[PDB]
Design a protein around this ligand. Sequence first.
Ligand SMILES: Nc1ncnc2c1ncn2[C@@H]1O[C@H](COP(=O)(O)CP(=O)(O)OP(=O)(O)O)[C@@H](O)[C@H]1O
Ligand SMILES: Nc1nc2nc(SCc3ccc(F)cc3)[nH]c2c(=O)[nH]1
Ligand SMILES: [Cl-]
Ligand SMILES: [Mg+2]
Ligand SMILES: [Mg+2]
Ligand code: NA
Ligand code: NA
Length: 157
Amino acid sequence: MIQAYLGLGSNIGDRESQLNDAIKILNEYDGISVSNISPIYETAPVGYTEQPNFLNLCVEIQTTLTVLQLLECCLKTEECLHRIRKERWGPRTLDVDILLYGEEMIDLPKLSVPHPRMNERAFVLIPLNDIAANVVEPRSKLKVKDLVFVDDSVKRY
Ligand SMILES: Nc1ncnc2c1ncn2[C@@H]1O[C@H](COP(=O)(O)CP(=O)(O)OP(=O)(O)O)[C@@H](O)[C@H]1O
Ligand SMILES: Nc1nc2nc(SCc3ccc(F)cc3)[nH]c2c(=O)[nH]1
Ligand SMILES: [Cl-]
Ligand SMILES: [Mg+2]
Ligand SMILES: [Mg+2]
Ligand code: NA
Ligand code: NA
């Protein structure tokens, strides 16, 4: 059994209902057991143009899946939630990102763990710190509580 952390996001549709449904679906896969869920935060979009605000959270799982098996479950969950994939990025019903998989470092064309952008994302680190403050991010070798930073664009929902 591996302790892993997922980052979830939604910025279109009924954001909160979609996040809750996603967690339930994730938990229903054999080999994934949801053990903790952060508070939900409303967050300003980063890395693109002006877009509707996100609801973001983090989830702790105990898994017996390999990290690629896990990734398949994450992407299937997005499909259950009807996520649209057009030529250009836009708002999405659900995004399920693998943040951390134990202390492992994976670099494959289809999978990068720890997530390559997490250490500079408040919408990740603030909810992650609520459930994983003492977990080590293996690239930096820092605990989450030593990466997190204050960011007024991330608010409790
Ligand atoms: N840690 C990770 N978690 C989830 N998908 C990952 C991943 N590392 C790589 N991927 C790949 O990323 C592909 C595109 O996923 P998307 O969800 O569209 C990116 P995004 O989550 O919108 O952007 P972001 O990575 O900047 O958060 C997936 O099909 C998967 O193969
Ligand atoms: N707050 C926040 N910003 C995030 N930026 C990304 S990737 C660029 C992007 C893609 C589509 C979109 F509509 C807005 C921004 N994912 C995010 C997330 O989950 N939360
Ligand atoms: Cl969508
Ligand atoms: Mg994603
Ligand atoms: Mg993402
Ligand atoms: Na399960
Ligand atoms: Na790579």
